[PDB]
Design a protein around this ligand. Structure first.
Ligand SMILES: Nc1ccc(-c2ccc(F)cc2)cc1NC(=O)C1CCOCC1
Ligand SMILES: [Ca+2]
Ligand SMILES: [Ca+2]
Ligand SMILES: [Zn+2]
Length: 368
């Protein structure tokens, strides 16, 4: 039936700024919050402000030297850390900006707090739209991500759960999460993503894990222009088979919105309904669920997507007519919740989708 939802948000998150022209806009989290508040969705869930995650919490995965660097590096002292900036991949796609470390603490805090809430059996779902920073590595920033909140949240769930399932519908490969758990059977990582001449360059379907982790990494590589029909016809079959074979006791769903139609940096053609069908599918299994954000660069559509997916988590029908809100002008010219797909060609043929599905099914038969 209906499920208890705990939602994590800090109103300072929208004030952090990557710099002029950088496509990551933390403002999109504020837009999301304000839109879902104006739909009345606060009436049906508990809203929590995350703690600022400490260096102790972050070093459960990241190296002491990398976290020390993130704690120290500032725009005023950049010339002094020229070597370490290169070493840790900071200063270009992952810039130094004012309050960088506090920004990492906020995004991380929501995910780990959500994990603790799930472990204590005090909620069925935990939501942190500021999280899902799937590219960050043990000792390296990558793809706008500095601290891997997901890896830290999964490590928290592993205190109480033998098997945790990670599902990733961001357009990019969940490489940092996959790498962290590549040699263990205690986390199954499942990523659907664009593959071929695209960041981060990993997530071939032949990447299946290593050692004890062999067959516990799953990668569904896709081409440009996947639509709701094509996505929906593989997602439920793959996740159902994963649930059958792996039998996890907790789930982490990264809901990166850069897989939507019209994303500034993406080339997929999903609507909000198609994207949200993934949340509906995962939710039917009735397992403890941590829902996280991710990418998304057309910020009006990010706010629509995560507002609707919060409504899906609550089993709340909300009208397509957008309510008035602080960012109402961003949703023109239509001022509707749902989006239309573009006329871009779907390079993922029905035969391709079924063929990749059948090859992943072969690999899932190797589980005990
Ligand atoms: N895939 C992804 C997922 C999450 C975040 C992220 C979310 C919240 C944050 F606070 C920080 C980062 C960033 C990305 N990066 C990119 O989409 C790509 C876009 C193309 O350039 C490379 C990175
Ligand atoms: Ca993905
Ligand atoms: Ca694994
Ligand atoms: Zn992405």
């Amino acid at each position: 039936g209906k499920k208890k939802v705990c939602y994590y948000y800090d109103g300072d998150i929208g004030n952090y700024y990557y710099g002029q022209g950088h496509p990551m806009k933390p403002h999109r989290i504020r837009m999301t919050h304000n839109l879902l508040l104006n739909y009345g969705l606060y009436r049906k869930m508990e809203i929590y402000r995350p703690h600022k995650a400490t260096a102790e919490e972050m070093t459960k995965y990241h190296s002491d030297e990398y976290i020390k660097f993130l704690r120290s590096i500032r725009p005023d002292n950049m010339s002094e850390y020229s070597k370490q900036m290169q070493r840790f991949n900071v200063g270009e796609d992952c810039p130094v900006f004012d309050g960088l470390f506090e920004f990492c603490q906020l995004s991380t805090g929501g995910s780990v707090a959500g994990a603790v809430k799930l472990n204590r059996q005090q909620t069925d779902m935990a939501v942190n739209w500021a999280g899902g920073l799937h590219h960050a590595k043990k000792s390296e920033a990558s793809g706008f991500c500095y601290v891997n909140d997901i890896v830290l949240a999964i490590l928290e769930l592993l205190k109480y759960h033998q098997r945790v399932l990670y599902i990733d519908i961001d357009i990019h490969h969940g490489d940092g999460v996959e790498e962290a758990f590549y040699t263990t059977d205690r986390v199954m990582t499942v990523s659907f993503h664009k593959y071929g001449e695209y960041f981060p360059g990993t997530g071939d379907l032949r990447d299946i894990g290593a050692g004890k982790g062999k067959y516990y990494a799953v990668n569904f590589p896709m081409r440009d222009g996947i639509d709701d029909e094509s996505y929906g016809q593989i997602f439920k079959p793959i996740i159902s088979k994963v649930m059958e074979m792996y039998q996890p006791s907790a789930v982490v769903l990264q809901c990166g919105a850069d897989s939507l139609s019209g994303d500034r940096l993406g080339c997929f053609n999903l609507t909000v309904k198609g994207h949200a069908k993934c949340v509906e599918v995962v939710k039917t299994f009735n397992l403890p669920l941590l829902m996280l954000g991710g990418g998304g660069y057309t910020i009006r559509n990010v706010a629509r997507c995560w507002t609707y997916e919060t409504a899906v988590a609550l089993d709340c029908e909300i009208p397509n007519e957008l309510p008035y809100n602080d960012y109402f002008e961003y949703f023109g010219p239509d001022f509707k919740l749902h989006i239309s797909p573009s006329n871009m060609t779907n390079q993922n043929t029905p035969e391709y989708m079924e063929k990749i599905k059948q090859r992943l099914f072969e690999n899932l038969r190797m589980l005990p």
